[PDB]
Amino acid sequence: YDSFSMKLIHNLNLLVDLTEEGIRRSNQQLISLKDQTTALEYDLQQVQKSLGTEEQEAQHIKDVYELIDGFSSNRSPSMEECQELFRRLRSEFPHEYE
Amino acid sequence: EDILAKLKLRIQERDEALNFRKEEKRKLEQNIEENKSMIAKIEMELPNQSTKYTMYQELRVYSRSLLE
């Protein structure tokens, strides 16, 4: 305990281990990153699918809002404007209509 | 009309969700491009790292044998 407490080639050995650990850590990062990249790409398709359906619904909402708003505008609607409106509303949007 | 006010409320809730998902798509698409660029850097450096290592293996044996 007392004696052990008081107690060129190293750089060649340590450098080849150092460089190979650089290679392996970079290699494992590459493998894991590729898998993660494919996971994010697959997740992106679910985002596109979910947002894509919502974009279609958003257009529907804009149509009823804009058409009734234009109808609310201060001009006398014609009779045909009324009939076509309720035909469109009832036929295209029966659930929202009721 | 009051229905139209309900509709504007529905538009507002919808617009916030839509802007979130649109920016989320951009952030996700950006992370994928960033990762592919990172992959390309590591993949491009993999021969260089392999080249250095092969030289280092030749250097390791040569320098040891010369000193021996």
Q: What is the 3-state secondary structure (H, E, C) of chain A?
A: CHHHHHCCHHHHHHHHHHHHHHHHHHHHHHHHHHHHHHHHHHHHHHHHHHHHHHHHHHHHHHHHHHHHHHHHCCCCCCHHHHHHHHHHHHHHCHHHHC
Q: Which residues of A touch B (CB under 8 A)?
A: 9, 12, 15-16, 19-20, 22-23, 26-27, 29-30, 33-34, 36-37, 40-41, 43-44, 47-48, 50-51, 54-55, 57-58, 61-62, 64-65, 68-69, 72
Are the Cβ atoms of A43 and B29 closer than 8 angstroms? no
Q: How far apart are CA A82 and CA A77, in angstroms?
A: 7
- Among residues A24, A50, A9, the alpha carbon closest in space to that of B63 is found at A9
- Among residues A43, B7, A64, the alpha carbon closest in space to that of A51 is found at A43
Are the Cβ atoms of B50 and A23 closer than 8 angstroms? yes
Both tokens of residue A68? 């009734």
- Among residues B15, B3, B39, B60, the alpha carbon closest in space to that of A58 is found at B15
Q: How far apart are CA A46 and CA B14, in angstroms?
A: 19
Contact B29, A51 (CB under 8 A): no
Both tokens of residue A66? 């804009």
Among A15, A50, A65, whose Cβ lies nearest the Cβ of B11? A65
Question: SS3 of B1, please?
Answer: coil
Q: How far apart are CA A54 and CA B25, in angstroms?
A: 14
Question: SS3 of B68, please?
Answer: coil
Both tokens of residue A97? 């209509």
Q: How far apart are CA A47 and CA A80, in angstroms?
A: 42
